[model samples]
Target: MKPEIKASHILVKDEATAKKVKEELGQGKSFEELAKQYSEDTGSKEKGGDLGFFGAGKMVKEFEDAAYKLKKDEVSEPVKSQFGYHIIKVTDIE
Candidate 1:
């Protein structure tokens, strides 16, 4: 059976913003709360960026890899490209 994961999208306005936010995250800020405010792609941000159950390319490779790298709870450092600063909150990545 395929694993169903829990994740969220967090595309930010700038690299610096994402960096600062990462600092906040390390200090105990909630991912959903921060993502809701910081994410420019608010389509998911509206619902705290939940990805639900995802498959190939639902999200881009850059982020998918980053999320996998972080796995769960841990935050992957912001990634660059199209957005210059994309964040991932992979809460339950099993």
Candidate 2:
């Protein structure tokens, strides 16, 4: 198994906003576009929410758990973290 994962996400302030983003994604909205427009993490948002690659313990446990559970190209439901809710997408496993 891969020791690290690459992912992207759209971070929003609340579950409702996260749900809205998820709905847009389901309707074919581009994840990168949505992240650029809505993600609060300015550091990663401009990079299309890219977190690069991370291994266990590199991220908050809740966020990491949701991320690790995803398979390549899969999107997760809203996951809450200290920063806010996240709509995570697993981009690569390596």
Candidate 3:
């Protein structure tokens, strides 16, 4: 079976800005588009926030926690890691 997973998150430079961006994305904005426009994680941002496939232990503790805890397509509020605050969206997976 596939390792269930599907998510996206906007990593900004600071918690305050991340929260604001998170709110914006929640207000019907496209996550991909917003990621491209606002995410500071340049690697993902360039691909519209596509992190590809990942398994357990592939990400930071906080990020992994939020990603695994949320249901597919769910927004996990704003979570913080060393990078900054993130507006995490579990996009899809099985």
- The TM-score values for the models, in the order shown, are 0.79, 0.94, 0.85
Per-model C-alpha lDDT, please? 0.74, 0.90, 0.79
Predicted structure with the largest lDDT when compared to the true one: 2
Weakest lDDT window of 10 consecutive positions for candidate 3: 1-10
The sequence of per-residue lDDT tens digits that candidate 2 reaches over residues 22-85 is 8898787799889998999988999989999999898898999999899899989999999899
Q: Order of all candidates by TM-score, from best down to worst?
A: 2, 3, 1
Once fitted onto the true fold, the runs of candidate 2 whose alpha carbons sit more than 4 angstroms away are none
Positional deviation of residue 30's Cα in model 3 after best superposition, in angstroms: 0.9
* Model 1 worst lDDT run, 10 consecutive residues: 1-10
Writing each residue's lDDT as its tens digit, candidate 3 over 1-94 gives: 3375766778887777877787787588888889988988877888778777777888888998888888877876778898888878777776
Winner on TM-score between 1 and 2 is 2
Give the C-alpha miss distance for residue 12 in model 1, angstroms. Answer: 0.8
How good is model 1 by TM-score? 0.79
